[PDB]
Every structure is written in structure tokens, then in C-alpha cells.
Amino acid sequence: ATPLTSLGSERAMFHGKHQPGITTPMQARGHLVAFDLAAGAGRKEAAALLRRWSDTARRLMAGEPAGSRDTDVARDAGPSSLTVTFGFGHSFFGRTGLEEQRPVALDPLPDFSSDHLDKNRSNGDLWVQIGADDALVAFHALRAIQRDAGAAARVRWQMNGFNRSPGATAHPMTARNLMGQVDGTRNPKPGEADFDRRIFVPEPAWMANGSYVVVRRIRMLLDDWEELSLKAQEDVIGRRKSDGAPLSGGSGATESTEMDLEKTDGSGELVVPINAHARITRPDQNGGAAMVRRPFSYHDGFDADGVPDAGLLFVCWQADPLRGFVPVQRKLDRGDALSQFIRHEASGLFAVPGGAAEGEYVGQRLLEG
Amino acid sequence: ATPLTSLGSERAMFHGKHQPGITTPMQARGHLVAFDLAAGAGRKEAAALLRRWSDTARRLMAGEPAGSRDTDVARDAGPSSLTVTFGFGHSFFGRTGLEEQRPVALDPLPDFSSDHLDKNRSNGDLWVQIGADDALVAFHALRAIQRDAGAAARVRWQMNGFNRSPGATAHPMTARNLMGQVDGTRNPKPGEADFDRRIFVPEEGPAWMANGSYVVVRRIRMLLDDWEELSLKAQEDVIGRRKSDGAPLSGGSGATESTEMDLEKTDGSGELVVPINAHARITRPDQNGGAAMVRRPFSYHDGFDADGVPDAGLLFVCWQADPLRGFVPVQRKLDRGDALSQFIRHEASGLFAVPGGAAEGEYVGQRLLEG
Numbered sequence: 002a003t004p005l006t007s008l009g010s011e012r013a014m015f016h017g018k019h020q021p022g023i024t025t026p027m028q029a030r031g032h033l034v035a036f037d038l039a040a041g042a043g044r045k046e047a048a049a050l051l052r053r054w055s056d057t058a059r060r061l062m063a064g065e066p067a068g069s070r071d072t073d074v075a076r077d078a079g080p081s082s083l084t085v086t087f088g089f090g091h092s093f094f095g096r097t098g099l100e101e102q103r104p105v106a107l108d109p110l111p112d113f114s115s116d117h118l119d120k121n122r123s124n125g126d127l128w129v130q131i132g133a134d135d136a137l138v139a140f141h142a143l144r145a146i147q148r149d150a151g152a153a154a155r156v157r158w159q160m161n162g163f164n165r166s167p168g169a170t171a172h173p174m175t176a177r178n179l180m181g182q183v184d185g186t187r188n189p190k191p192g193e194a195d196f197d198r199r200i201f202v203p204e205p206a207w208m209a210n211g212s213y214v215v216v217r218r219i220r221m222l223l224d225d226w227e228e229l230s231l232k233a234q235e236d237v238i239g240r241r242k243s244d245g246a247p248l249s250g251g252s253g254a255t256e257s258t259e260m261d262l263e264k265t266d267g268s269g270e271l272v273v274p275i276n277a278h279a280r281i282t283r284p285d286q287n288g289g290a291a292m293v294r295r296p297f298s299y300h301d302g303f304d305a306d307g308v309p310d311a312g313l314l315f316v317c318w319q320a321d322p323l324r325g326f327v328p329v330q331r332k333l334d335r336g337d338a339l340s341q342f343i344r345h346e347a348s349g350l351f352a353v354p355g356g357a358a359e360g361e362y363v364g365q366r367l368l369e370g
Numbered sequence: 371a372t373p374l375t376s377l378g379s380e381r382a383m384f385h386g387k388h389q390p391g392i393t394t395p396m397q398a399r400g401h402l403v404a405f406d407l408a409a410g411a412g413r414k415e416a417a418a419l420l421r422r423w424s425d426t427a428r429r430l431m432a433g434e435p436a437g438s439r440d441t442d443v444a445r446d447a448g449p450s451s452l453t454v455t456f457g458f459g460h461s462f463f464g465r466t467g468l469e470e471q472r473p474v475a476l477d478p479l480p481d482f483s484s485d486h487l488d489k490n491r492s493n494g495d496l497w498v499q500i501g502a503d504d505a506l507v508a509f510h511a512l513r514a515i516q517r518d519a520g521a522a523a524r525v526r527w528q529m530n531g532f533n534r535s536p537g538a539t540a541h542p543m544t545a546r547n548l549m550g551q552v553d554g555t556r557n558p559k560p561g562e563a564d565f566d567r568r569i570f571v572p573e574e575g576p577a578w579m580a581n582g583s584y585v586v587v588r589r590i591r592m593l594l595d596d597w598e599e600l601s602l603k604a605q606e607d608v609i610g611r612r613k614s615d616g617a618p619l620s621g622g623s624g625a626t627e628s629t630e631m632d633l634e635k636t637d638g639s640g641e642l643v644v645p646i647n648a649h650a651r652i653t654r655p656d657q658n659g660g661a662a663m664v665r666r667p668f669s670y671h672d673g674f675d676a677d678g679v680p681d682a683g684l685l686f687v688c689w690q691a692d693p694l695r696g697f698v699p700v701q702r703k704l705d706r707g708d709a710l711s712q713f714i715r716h717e718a719s720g721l722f723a724v725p726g727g728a729a730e731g732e733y734v735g736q737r738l739l740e741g
């Protein structure tokens with residue numbers, strides 16, 4: 002049986018073809034942070050920053066302290082599956098005089114009618130995703146990365162997230178979200194023949210083996226959601242809450258059982274409703290549009306009226322946003338049974354390049370003089 | 371070897387002599403919440419509420435769903451060491467016509483000169499502590515307790531915290547805080563002859579508090595921007611113990627966290643090796659006429675402000691039989707006398723009476739609240 006100490010001893014690779022934090026297994030603790038380059042900081046300052054950040058990432062992902070003046074916060078813990086991932090926003094390129102290298106894929110997301118975005122908690126020059134299965138390890142990484150910014154960049158926004166911890170269930174299982182739904186079942190899987198083309202830029206050149214991430218802070222309107230009946234909730238998604246099986250599934254069905262989108266009930270109504278979330282998001286309903294969803298849940302407290310600031314830190318990965326998040330979200334905007342129960346309140350789109358080779362730093366091909 | 375699945379299968383007792391969440395081992399996820407009774411709510415409404423809350427705690431601590439309309443957020447997870455703990459604030463008693471039953475131990479904390487308390491994030495009629503080693507299990511419990519309040523109470527304030535996870539280290543060890551210090555070494559330990567008298571109201575102040583304890587909660591921001599500019603020597607002088615292993619500064623290279631602190635040892639210049647204002651010197655029971663407490667905190671980080679200052683620190687939670695023989699005299703001294711005071715800010719506070727555990731067939735606080 003897998004030992005408890007494996008929570009701490011497990012580690013992800015920093016160096017490799019792809020950056021960690023994309024196909025890396027879900028982590029119990031997450032920090033998303035965006036930085037803006039400081040006044041007077043340009044391409045040279047950005048290059049030095051990414052070099053510092055990569056060195057910090059390399060050390061901490063191996064469970065080692067920072068190079069100098071380590072805080073000891075993560076001392077005695079193993080790497081705990083820590084990953085650090087770096088991305089570049091549209092604005093980064095104007096700030097560094099690198100507009101020639103700005104991918105078309107970074108063109109601004111649509112202004113969807115259902116958007117309620119806080120501009121101050123959205124976008125940014127630089128994005129860092131930190132995740133681990135230990136909270137001190139995760140915070141230690143966040144603080145080290147943030148302190149590495151120094152005079153070169155400032156924290157624009159920062160969000161905390163969480164997921165199920167390793168060992169919480171008797172067997173490895175798909176995660177749940179705060180709506181109580183099984184969440185993550187139908188992601189494209191490594192090993193599928195079209196996975197690389199769906200998710201990664203093929204081998205501008207600086208983005209080779211990279212991916213595009215869309216981040217959305219989506220508040221769940223739990224006060225309304227939880228007033229619904231179980232049947233009503235399951236109709237919104239088109240899958241059962243108990244096990245994640247399609248509503249069209251029999252008693253032996255599981256989350257992986259194929260949808261039957263034609264099956265009707267006693268009343269002649271579609272068993273998986275025509276507006277069900279897990280119907281209308283499918284690649285086969287969106288001209289092949291696909292993405293890898295790798296989110297965190299969040300809860301940041303209650304307001305004066307007792308409304309929870311809680312939901313999903315939606316994070317999705319694709320080779321081209323126009324072949325992933327964007328067409329799907331265009332459809333969900335007004336067509337999704339789920340839309341009235343959620344609010345998109347922050348947004349980001351970042352170019353996440355390939356992994357660092359040994360002796361190199363993340364984004365080196367882009368930033369090197 | 372302990373299996374990874376033990377994180378989820380481990381469970382704490384709800385029913386018992388003492389409430390869970392006091393001597394329970396440290397948990398990876400914490401939610402602290404205070405409620406104020408609604409307009410018109412009195413003893414009857416409070417009794418019904420604690421009755422609901424107790425049923426909720428009982429089910430969830432055994433890894434069961436809520437009695438009705440469960441959200442499925444905790445489905446498939448084990449209990450994950452979930453505990454739910456209930457306390458009563460000074461203000462509760464005026465609201466319920468139970469002033470005769472208000473413990474003297476709930477008398478308002480002093481207004482310390484170093485206090486920077488947000489009144490809207492302090493105190494309250496009722497306090498709930500929720501902890502677990504899984505975050506969905508922890509949130510599920512928070513939401514269930516909060517929804518149980520209904521027409522009886524509103525959320526006054528709510529704070530989130532975290533600690534090291536089980537399995538993070540190779541062997542079980544004392545926790546660390548966000549200043550990087552070993553934190554918890556010299557806590558009174560169950561089994562010590564004087565532990566019960568230090569921490570719990572005896573089985574036979576008011577009778578309804580039998581086997582209970584008094585909790586002081588402080589949201590203490592750590593001034594990490596200033597703290598992390600110090601040399602290691604300066605940081606270790608503030609506490610009086612090493613960061614690497616938690617040993618007293620008076621210890622040699624063979625010393626460990628269990629090595630006795632030498633309060634008399636001086637250097638070549640005649641100054642104390644463990645400084646006279648060192649935190650881990652001046653907080654000791656032997657430096658405070660026997661004042662003692664069990665510290666069982668969570669760390670917190672709630673983001674950064676516009677200037678990049680982290681809203682991060684310690685959700686300080688301490689347990690004692692009498693605050694005047696615990697938190698109060700110690701903080702009276704730390705206020706201006708502690709080398710650590712310069713690097714922290716007390717930004718919220720609470721003092722709550724936490725009664726004995728619910729017996730089977732009973733709810734928490736029943737002796738106080740029953741008609």
C-alpha cells in the first residue's frame with residue numbers, strides 16, 4: 002500500500018520538454034499570481050527575473066531551500082509534488098518591446114455578455130501557477146517567487162485555491178468541486194493520438210512545446226444552487242452527482258460510460274438535456290474544440306449578507322484558445338443551464354512556453370539578448 | 371508503515387468528556403467562524419441551533435452526509451480527522467437572559483497598547499472551529515454549519531487557515547509557522563500531571579462549563595517584509611530558539627528541541643545567551659507565576675495588498691482553564707516587552723467559553739441551554 006510519507010516525498014520534474022503544472026496530477030493547494038513589470042523594467046529586467054524565477058523553481062521543486070536567505074518555512078518537508086509554471090500575458094510584449102514575438106493566440110478573449118470581470122484582478126504581464134500537496138511548501142514557494150520579483154515587478158493579483166488531499170479517498174478518484182459535482186472526467190488524455198495537437202504548440206518559435214492557459218475566477222452562486230432539487234442539479238450538468246455517470250447511464254454506469262445524447266425519458270424528453278453543461282461542452286458539439294481543465298476550488302470568506310465568496314479557479318490548457326475555451330464559452334454564455342448559477346469575476350490569458358532544459362531558464366528563447 | 375489512506379480514514383470522536391479540537395492533533399485545514407444571534411433570538415433559538423449543529427457535527431465527523439439536502443462535496447472522502455468545536459462569547463449571555471450563567475472567565479480581555487483589532491472581525495455571540503486534513507471535507511463542514519444557522523444567527527466573521535499536511539515530512543515532527551520557526555515544542559502535553567488543571571475546568575465558575583475550556587483567538591499578522599530583512603542571528607534572538615531544529619540558543623551543536631533552556635547562561639560580555647526579551651523566555655510558565663496554555667493554531671495567508679504586503683500570519687488559538695492564568699498575564703507582558711512584538715500585529719480577537727463534550731443522546735451546551 003502507498004505510504005503516507007509519499008505525500009511529501011513525491012516530486013515533479015522541473016526540466017523537460019513541457020513545463021510542469023499542465024499534465025501534472027491535481028494538487029491539494031494552489032496559488033495563482035499575476036505580476037506587472039515595474040516602471041522602468043524592460044526586456045533585460047524581464048530576462049533576469051525569469052532566470053531568478055527558474056532557479057528558484059528548480060531548487061524548490063527538488064525540496065531544496067532558496068539559494069540565499071531561505072525562510073525555513075518548508076524545512077523538513079519533502080517536495081510534496083510542488084510545481085511552478087510561468088506564463089506571459091498579451092501586455093508583456095509591449096512592455097518589453099517584443100511585439101514581433103507576441104503570438105496571435107494571445108489576442109484578447111471576447112467580452113462575453115455574462116462577463117462580470119474585475120479588471121484589477123484580471124490579466125497582467127506575467128503569470129505564475131504554484132501548486133503542491135503541502136500548504137507550507139506551497140506558501141514557501143509563493144513567497145520565494147514573489148520576493149524574487151524585487152524591484153522588477155509587482156504583484157498585480159493573487160488567488161488561493163485548494164483541492165482534495167492525497168489519501169482522502171480509499172482509491173484514486175476524480176476530484177469534486179464545491180457544487181458537489183464530479184469534476185474532471187472527460188479531459189483529453191496523454192496517449193490519445195490527438196492529445197499533443199489539442200494541447201501543445203508543435204515543435205512564434207519561442208512557444209514551441211508550450212500551451213495557452215485561460216484562467217477564470219468563477220464564483221458559484223451556492224445560495225441559489227443549493228436551493229435546487231437533486232434532480233434539477235443533475236439536469237444542469239447532465240451527469241449524476243453520486244458517481245459522475247451520464248444521466249443516460251444504467252445502474253452499472255460510471256463517469257467513463259459513454260453519453261447517450263439521443264435517449265429519451267418516459268415523457269419523450271432527452272435524458273441528457275439539450276442545454277446540459279456536459280453535453281454542450283463536448284468537442285463533438287463544438288467542431289472539435291478541446292482543452293485540459295486543471296482547476297482549483299476557492300473560498301475566501303463571506304460578505305455582510307452571508308454570501309460565500311466561493312467557486313472554481315477554472316484553469317484550462319489548449320494549443321490555441323480559438324480551438325478551445327473561446328468557442329465553448331461563446332456557446333455557454335447564454336446556452337448553458339449552468340450559467341445562471343455562476344459568475345465569471347476575473348480572467349486571464351497567458352502564453353506558457355516549453356519546459357526549461359538543463360542549464361536554461363523558462364522563456365529563454367524569447368528573452369535572451 | 372502508515373498508509374496514505376489513513377489521512378482520509380482517521381477520525382476523531384464527537385461524543386466524549388471533552389469537545390474535540392482541543393487535544394486533537396494539528397490539522398491541515400482550518401475555518402474559524404463567529405455568529406451573532408438574529409434579532410429576537412434568545413435561549414430557545416440558541417438551544418435549537420446548538421442541537422442542529424451537534425447533529426451536523428456528529429454525522430460529518432463520522433464521514434456521513436448531512437441529515438438533509440447534503441451537497442455531496444465530501445462524498446467518497448473519509449472523515450479526514452474532521453473536528454467541530456463550539457464556544458460562547460460574553461455577549462451571548464445578555465442576548466439569552468442567561469447573565470447569571472456567564473462565566474467570570476469571559477470578562478473582556480484587556481485593551482493592550484499594541485492592539486490593532488478590527489471590531490467587526492472580533493468577538494461575537496457564538497464561535498465554531500472546524501478543522502480537517504482534507505479541504506473539501508473541511509469546506510463541506512463549514513458550509514453545513516453555516517447553513518444550519520438559518521433564522522437563528524448570522525455570520526459575523528470567518529477566517530481560513532492551514533497547517534502542514536500529514537505525510538509532508540519523513541517522520542512526525544513539530545509544525546512550523548510562516549516566520550519559519552518550529553512552533554509548538556513546549557505545549558503542555560496530555561499525560562503530564564498538571565495538564566488537566568492547566569487546560570480544563572474541573573468536572574465539579576458555572577456548572578455548565580464542567581470539563582470545558584476557555585479559548586482565546588487572535589488573528590496575528592506577521593510583518594514578513596520586515597522579519598525577512600533580519601539576519602538569522604537577529605531572528606533567533608527574537609525567539610530564543612534556533613530555526614533549524616528548535617533548540618534553545620543556550621544549547622550546543624548537539625542540542626535538540628527537547629534540550630532544557632538555560633535561563634541563567636551568559637556570554638563573555640555578561641549578557642544572557644537567551645535574550646532577556648526573547649519570546650520563548652518570557653512566555654514560559656516559570657516566568658509567569660505558572661500561567662500556561664495549549665497553543666493549537668493555524669497559519670493564514672489571504673492575499674497581498676496594493677503595496678505587495680502579505681495579509682499573512684498566525685491564527686493564534688490557545689486553550690486554558692482560566693484566561694487570567696493563561697493568555698492574559700502572558701500577553702500583558704508580551705505587549706511591549708516581547709522582542710517579537712515589533713514584527714507582528716494583533717488585528718482581531720475573541721474569547722469564548724467552550725463547554726465539555728456532548729454525551730451520547732445530548733448536544734453541546736445542553737446543560738446551559740435546555741429549558
Ligand code: HEM
Nearest residue numbers: 182183184185186187219279282283284313326329330343
Ligand atoms: C464554475 C464553473 C464550472 C463548473 C462547476 C463546471 C463543471 C463541470 C462538470 C461537473 C463537468 C462534467 C465532468 C467532467 O467531464 O469534468 C464539466 C465538463 C466540462 N466542462 Fe465545465 N464547469 C465549469 C466551467 C466551465 C467552463 C467556463 C468551460 C469552458 C468554457 C468548461 C468546459 C468543460 C468541458 C470542455 C467539459 C468536458 C465536456 C466533455 O467533453 O465531456 N467548464 N464541467
Ligand code: HEM
Nearest residue numbers: 551552553554555556590650653654655684697700701714
Ligand atoms: C505570530 C505570533 C507568534 C509567534 C510567531 C509565536 C512563536 C512561538 C515560538 C517559535 C515558540 C517556541 C517554540 C514553542 O515552544 O512553541 C513559542 C512559544 C510560546 N509562545 Fe508564542 N508565538 C506567537 C504568539 C504568541 C502569543 C500571543 C502568546 C500568548 C499570549 C504566545 C505564547 C507562547 C507560549 C506560552 C510558548 C511556550 C513557552 C514555553 O517554552 O513554555 N505566543 N511561540
